[PDB]
Amino acid sequence: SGFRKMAFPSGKVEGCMVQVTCGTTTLNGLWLDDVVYCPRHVICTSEDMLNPNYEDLLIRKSNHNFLVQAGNVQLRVIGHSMQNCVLKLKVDTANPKTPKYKFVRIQPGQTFSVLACYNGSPSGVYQCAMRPNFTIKGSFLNGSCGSVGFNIDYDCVSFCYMHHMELPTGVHAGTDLEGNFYGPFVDRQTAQAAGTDTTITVNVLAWLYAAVINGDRWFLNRFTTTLNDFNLVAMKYNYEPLTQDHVDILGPLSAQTGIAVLDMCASLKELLQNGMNGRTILGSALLEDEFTPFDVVRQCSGVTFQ
Amino acid sequence: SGFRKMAFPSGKVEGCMVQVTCGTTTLNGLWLDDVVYCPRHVICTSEDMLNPNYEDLLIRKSNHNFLVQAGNVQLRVIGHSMQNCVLKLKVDTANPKTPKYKFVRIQPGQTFSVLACYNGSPSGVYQCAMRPNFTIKGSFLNGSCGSVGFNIDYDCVSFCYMHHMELPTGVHAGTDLEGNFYGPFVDRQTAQAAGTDTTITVNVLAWLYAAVINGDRWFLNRFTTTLNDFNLVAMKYNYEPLTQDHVDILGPLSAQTGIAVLDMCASLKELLQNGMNGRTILGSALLEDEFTPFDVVRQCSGVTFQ
Ligand SMILES: *[C@](O)(C(=O)NC1CC1)[C@H](CCCC)NC(=O)[C@@H]1[C@@H]2[C@H](CN1C(=O)[C@@H](NC(=O)NC1(CS(=O)(=O)C(C)(C)C)CCCCC1)C(C)(C)C)C2(C)C
Ligand SMILES: *[C@](O)(C(=O)NC1CC1)[C@H](CCCC)NC(=O)[C@@H]1[C@@H]2[C@H](CN1C(=O)[C@@H](NC(=O)NC1(CS(=O)(=O)C(C)(C)C)CCCCC1)C(C)(C)C)C2(C)C
């Protein structure tokens, strides 16, 4: 038993991390085959971030301006190209540790593991979720740009995030591995609007099911609620609308615990209105929304990977 | 910025996990050089748990009763020996991916990363701490026995834990890599006394320093205390006696934030007596004691490893 925030094993991603330097800016790059992916704003200076012209800046840059290192052994940049907000630094050596990689663009509510790197060296791994406002609550300092988020299907590493920048609130934003930002953000140092964050309801319900499997059962009621009456209670506390598809996704968890989704909704319908009086659920005093239904099945069935 | 429970990169540990099978029992083993380490109760059946005689049980077993597989490769066992509560299976092939390993026995209050494994395959990594009662709050199912805990010291992997069994309270217990259990426990299915769990005070203080660096400063008061008055409040709510040694390690955190340790103790002093009042520090409504001051320095400075 037990329940903790689990990140995927980072072994297959550590071998793809390199150091990328352009002038005085040093950040991380993703070395897959003979291509090195990194944030395109590595070619900028201090006052270039304020209003950059990336086309004009890349043109004044040449191949010997990019310094790519993989540990002590180096790589020679052969051809630089731009794809949206990421830089394609092609090299003369193909990565022998290239795994079965995969480029995916995730939806708000899905979780992934982040391998935080500095100077091309892995520092730590942790799990987080893409918030409904297309930001992530991660842990990043200077030098962490280029760190990637990923999942493992089985042997297929699914890259889905690359860190770019930090918001004034303290959350973080980035792109997929094709250079397209998550959200309405642009890679420019200027104040931009960020949306209001909501609570992922289908994730809170999966977390409550995890609490039932582990023994926490006090939050449970005997009543039921509609699929519409619950949405009234949800949409006040800035919770996210619950659909019929979410009920079908929670099938496995509903069948193992013998508690219908609409029954667990009635338990959640009561918790949001009254509070918790000062109790705890799974060792937490707040409701957790960073566990997808699939994350709960992994921790309560032992799903392993390559 | 940011702060999340962060685990060490598990790349160097994934290549050491193998599958050990003895009869019907299949669990995980640690492959370092030409030795495989696994819990000794792999030789037990279902009836042996109540009262196992490990000497008499091991004698009835031979080298060909132990089958070890590192994925698709079979490791033929040559010599089996028993050291405390772990079994050694010397195989004919040395692990070519043997990292720079190291066997350590951690103290209560220290943290480490756990690589939960099933059938010799890594399932995920998470961070936890050794509780003062020599238990850990982990996440383990059936087949997870043999999963190891570790720290990464630059280029040296420090193995410090191997999972063995689960307690009635939902917590877990195990041994070091020499076979010596953490705590008074013995590997036998029989009611066994566990100790009262206290809160690691030096970790809560370090966690409060992390909140100050990240922006959370509402809990800072204007009082101050010595080292003895705070211990009266701490020892009632089950915290560890705060010693002068704990004040000395928190230097880097106190020097960066400009807040003395005795100053943070007064702010903590009010936090135990008056509660928090539906408030959250670092996004948590409870006080966290699973972050050593070394962990906080790591996330707030950028320590990487090999
Ligand atoms: C990353 O590139 C890196 O690690 N580089 C190596 C050299 C150290 C670096 C690190 C981010 C902090 C964790 N990322 C950046 O420098 C990017 C790029 C420049 C500025 N930033 C960035 O993160 C800004 N944040 C920022 O610009 N946020 C906004 C504007 S704001 O934050 O509202 C304000 C007007 C500055 C107050 C822009 C985009 C949307 C969010 C708001 C800070 C360095 C100030 C944190 C690029 C080109 C965007
Ligand atoms: C591990 O061997 C494994 O993963 N095997 C693979 C093949 C399935 C397995 C993991 C189980 C839970 C994570 N570990 C065990 O089976 C050990 C060994 C037998 C029994 N257990 C075990 O964990 C017991 N727990 C237990 O016995 N705890 C106590 C006694 S008790 O819990 O108070 C009670 C009287 C049984 C209620 C003894 C040890 C100290 C704590 C108390 C359970 C399977 C019941 C969880 C060994 C040989 C100890």
Q: How far apart are CA A150 and CA A104, in angstroms?
A: 9
CB distance B44 to B25 below 8 Å: yes
| A203, A208, A210, A211 alpha-carbon torsion, rounded to 10° | 150
Ligand 1 midpoint to CA A9 (Å): 29
Q: Is A96 on the interface with B (CB under 8 A)?
A: no
DSSP 8-state code for residue A196 = P
Chain A CB contacts of B142 under 8 Å are 302
**Paired strand residues for A134:** none
- Angle of the B261-274 helix axis to the B229-236 helix axis, nearest 10: 40
Q: Which positions ≥6 away from B219 have C-beta within 8 Å?
A: B208, B211, B267, B270, B271, B279, B281
Instruction: Tell me which ligand sits closest to the C-alpha of residue B145.
Output: 2
Pairing type for strands B86-91 and B148-153 reads unpaired
Q: Beta-carbon neighbour count of residue A262 at 10 Å?
A: 18
Query: 2.10.240.10, 2.60.40.2230, 1.10.1840.10, 3.40.50.2300: which CATH number matches B201-300?
Result: 1.10.1840.10
Phi, psi of A112 (to 5 degrees): -160, 165
43-82 of A, contacting B, C-beta below 8 A: none
Phi and psi angles of residue B179, each rounded to the nearest 5 degrees, phi first? 95, 0
Marked catalytic residue, from A38, A41, A164, A265: A41
Q: Is A145 a catalytic residue?
A: yes
State in Å, rounded, how far the first CA of chain A is from the last one. 23
Query: Chain A: nearest CA to B59, how far in angstroms?
Result: 33
The two three-digit tokens of residue B206, written as one number: 């370090």
Nearest-Cα distance to chain A for B56, in Å, is: 31
CA-nearest of A128, A91, A131, A94 to A111 is A128
Chain pair A-B, CB pairs under 8 angstroms: 156
Residue B138 dihedral angles phi and psi, to the nearest 5°: -105, -165
Pairing of strands A100-103, A67-70: unpaired
Resolution at which this structure was determined, Å: 2.3
- CATH class, domain B11-91, is mainly beta
Q: Where does chain B break, by residue before each gap (C–N > 2.5 Å)?
A: none
Provide the annotated active-site residues of B: 41, 145
> Which residues of chain B have a CB within 8 Å of the CB of A3?
139
Experimental method: X-ray
Strands (E), B46-155: 66-70, 73-83, 86-91, 101-103, 111-118, 121-129, 148-153
Which of A304, A270, A262, A263 is CA-nearest to residue A287?
Answer: A270
**Which of B 170-229 lie inside 8 A of A, CB atoms?**
170-172, 214-215
When CB atoms are compared, the residue of B2, B10, B170 closest to A10 is B10
Using CA atoms, how far apart are residues B29 and B22, in angstroms rounded to an integer?
A: 12
Ligand closest to Cα of A182 equals 1
